[PDB]
Structure 1
Amino acid sequence: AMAQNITARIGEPLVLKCKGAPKKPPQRLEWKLNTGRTEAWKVLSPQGGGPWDSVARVLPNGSLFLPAVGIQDEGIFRCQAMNRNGKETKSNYRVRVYQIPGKPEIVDSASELTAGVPNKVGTCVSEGSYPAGTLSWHLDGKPLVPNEKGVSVKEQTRRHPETGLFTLQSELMVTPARGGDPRPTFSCSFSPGLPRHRALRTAPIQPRVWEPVPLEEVQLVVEPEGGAVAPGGTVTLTCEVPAQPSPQIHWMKDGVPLPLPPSPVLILPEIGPQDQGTYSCVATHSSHGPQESRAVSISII
């Protein structure tokens, strides 16, 4: 292109060369610019104390000097110069600015994820960028692409009117599959939109995954766990119905209700071969169909 692209850091000095200009007077040169500040084409006079002299000043060599460039200085800068040969030279610049935010952080991260359901892993936050830029996630050292699974991201971009700088947020949500990696490792990174620059990365986090046992409506535990016992001695059967305050529990052997009153517990002491069989409990409720616990096989050896 004719226009040379200039990329400058916010808050830093910038010098724009007026090519083909004599180094000392006499100089036939003129700067014309159009920036966020002017909202129009303006001649930038070389004399001291001009309208813009706290922001942009022409140097003795004809170069344009900006002590501390800002977002509003983005725009077009043109110099038309004349050598001592009568040689006509033009310089055309397009100025864009940038700022690199501080290192991104993951806030409110989860120590433990629950397999089988959505979890908020954490929220990546980036403060003080221009232009906006973007946040992305890594998983086990590889890029994590959204909306596969189970995996989703809630993103937002916010501009601070007092500085023109951006705050970025990326909230990561995952649904870990049962049988998966019990310690997935995540990290987030910020990619500047300008200039070309290394990604800034958070320290990684490694939440553990807990796989909840499937919840039975009627729960049966047997001590000892096996339901296998030496001759003589005891087995105790215990029944629980979490969703009911006052459950009515009826014990069964081999699919047939035992001639007993309702009770949450059934102890089988002095076990002989005759006590061998499949046991379970049934929770009855008025207006509802009965529910059975898992079947436990009790044997002797």
Structure 2
Amino acid sequence: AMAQNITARIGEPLVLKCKGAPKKPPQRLEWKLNTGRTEAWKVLSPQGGGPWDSVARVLPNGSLFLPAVGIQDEGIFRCQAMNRNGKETKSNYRVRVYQIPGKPEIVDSASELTAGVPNKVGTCVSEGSYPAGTLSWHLDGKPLVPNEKGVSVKEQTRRHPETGLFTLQSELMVTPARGGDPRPTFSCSFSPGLPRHRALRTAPIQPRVWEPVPLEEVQLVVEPEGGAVAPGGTVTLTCEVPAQPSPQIHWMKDGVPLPLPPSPVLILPEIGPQDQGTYSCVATHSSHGPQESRAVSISIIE
């Protein structure tokens, strides 16, 4: 367009040329601007000690000088100049500013993820940006897209009135599928909205994925683990009901309750071929249907 887009870094000097203006007096040029400070079209006098002389000053060559540009300096800057020949020359600038935040961080990141359930992997944080910008995630070296799979992100943006800069937060939530990557690798990046800029990337994190064994209401454990023992000796059957303080445990052999009193443990010493068969325990309870543990096969080897 006619207006030239200017992109300046906050806190840095900026010079705007008044094109087609004589280097030395006499000059016939005038600056008109409209920024966040003025909230209106104002003429900027070339004389020293003006209302804005601490923020913007006209240079001897007609160029406009801002020693330390700020967010409030965003707006339109126009110079109208007559050459000495002399034809009217116009300069139209649209000034936008920016600040790059420090390297983003991942805070409160999880060392271990639990498969099958939502986990907060961590929260990416970015402080001191203008404009806001955006945070995104990477998984195993590739962009991680949200709301697919069981991957969700909670984002928020906060502006500091004290400086006008932004604080960004991105909380990553994943539900690891069973049989998946035992060590997923995540990283976070900040993408400036201005200017066009290479992303600022965090160091990667590599949480581990733990896959919990399916929890049975009635848990049976047999030593030895296999359920096979040489002739003689002993096999101990222990079974437990985690949700009950005083479980009543009745032992069964091949689907039939054994002629025994309730007991959490059943030891089978001096194992003979007659002692072979499928074993399990049944937890009974008042006002509730009984529950059975997993069935264990007990045999003998030669």
- Does TM-score exceed 0.5, indicating one fold? yes
Q: Following the alignment from structure 1 to structure 2, what is the Cα–Cα distance between the partners of residues 29 and 227?
A: 99
Give the number of equivalent residue pairs.
301
Give CA-to-partner distance per residue, 1:69-91, whole Å, 9 cap, x none: 00000000000000110211000
SS of 1:274's equivalent in the other structure is helix
TM-superposed CA distance for 1:272, in Å, is: 0.5
Q: Following the alignment from structure 1 to structure 2, what is the Cα–Cα distance between the partners of residues 222 and 289?
A: 25
Alignment-derived partner of residue 141 in structure 2: 141
TM-superposed CA distance for 1:209, in Å, is: 0.3
Give CA-to-partner distance per residue, 1:115-168, whole Å, 9 cap, x none: 000000000000000000000000000000000110000000000000000000
SS of 2:33's equivalent in the other structure is strand
> Given the two structures, how large is their TM-score scaled by the length of structure 2?
0.99
1:68-107 residue pairs with structure 2 within 5 A? 68-107=68-107
Alignment-derived partner of residue 244 in structure 1: 244
Alignment-derived partner of residue 51 in structure 1: 51
SS of 1:290's equivalent in the other structure is strand
Q: Following the alignment from structure 2 to structure 1, what is the Cα–Cα distance between the partners of residues 54 and 92?
A: 23
Root-mean-square deviation over aligned CA pairs: 0.3
Alignment-derived partner of residue 184 in structure 2: 184
Q: Following the alignment from structure 2 to structure 1, what is the Cα–Cα distance between the partners of residues 73 and 232?
A: 93
SS of 1:11's equivalent in the other structure is coil
Q: Following the alignment from structure 2 to structure 1, what is the Cα–Cα distance between the partners of residues 226 and 168?
A: 55
Give CA-to-partner distance per residue, 1:160-195, whole Å, 9 cap, x none: 000000000000000000000000000000000000
Give CA-to-partner distance per residue, 1:35-83, whole Å, 9 cap, x none: 0000000000000000000000000000000000000000000000001
Alignment-derived partner of residue 40 in structure 1: 40
Q: Following the alignment from structure 1 to structure 2, what is the Cα–Cα distance between the partners of residues 42 and 273?
A: 105
Unmatched tracts of structure 1, length 5 or more: none
Q: Following the alignment from structure 1 to structure 2, what is the Cα–Cα distance between the partners of residues 74 and 53?
A: 17
Q: Following the alignment from structure 2 to structure 1, what is the Cα–Cα distance between the partners of residues 215 and 248?
A: 19
Give CA-to-partner distance per residue, 1:244-290, whole Å, 9 cap, x none: 00000000001000000000000000011000000000000000000
Alignment-derived partner of residue 267 in structure 1: 267
Q: Following the alignment from structure 1 to structure 2, what is the Cα–Cα distance between the partners of residues 227 and 154?
A: 49
Q: Following the alignment from structure 2 to structure 1, what is the Cα–Cα distance between the partners of residues 22 and 272?
A: 115
Give CA-to-partner distance per residue, 1:211-253, whole Å, 9 cap, x none: 0000000000001111100001110100100000000000000
Task: State the 4+ residue runs in structure 1 displaced beyond 6 angstroms.
Answer: none
> Percent of aligned pairs with the same residue?
100
Q: Following the alignment from structure 1 to structure 2, what is the Cα–Cα distance between the partners of residues 29 and 251?
A: 103
Q: Following the alignment from structure 1 to structure 2, what is the Cα–Cα distance between the partners of residues 212 and 11?
A: 54
Q: Following the alignment from structure 1 to structure 2, what is the Cα–Cα distance between the partners of residues 280 and 29?
A: 99
Q: Following the alignment from structure 2 to structure 1, what is the Cα–Cα distance between the partners of residues 158 and 257?
A: 66
Q: Following the alignment from structure 1 to structure 2, what is the Cα–Cα distance between the partners of residues 86 and 250?
A: 110
Q: Following the alignment from structure 1 to structure 2, what is the Cα–Cα distance between the partners of residues 242 and 152?
A: 33
Q: Following the alignment from structure 1 to structure 2, what is the Cα–Cα distance between the partners of residues 70 and 147?
A: 38
SS of 1:72's equivalent in the other structure is helix
Alignment-derived partner of residue 12 in structure 2: 12
Unmatched tracts of structure 2, length 5 or more: none
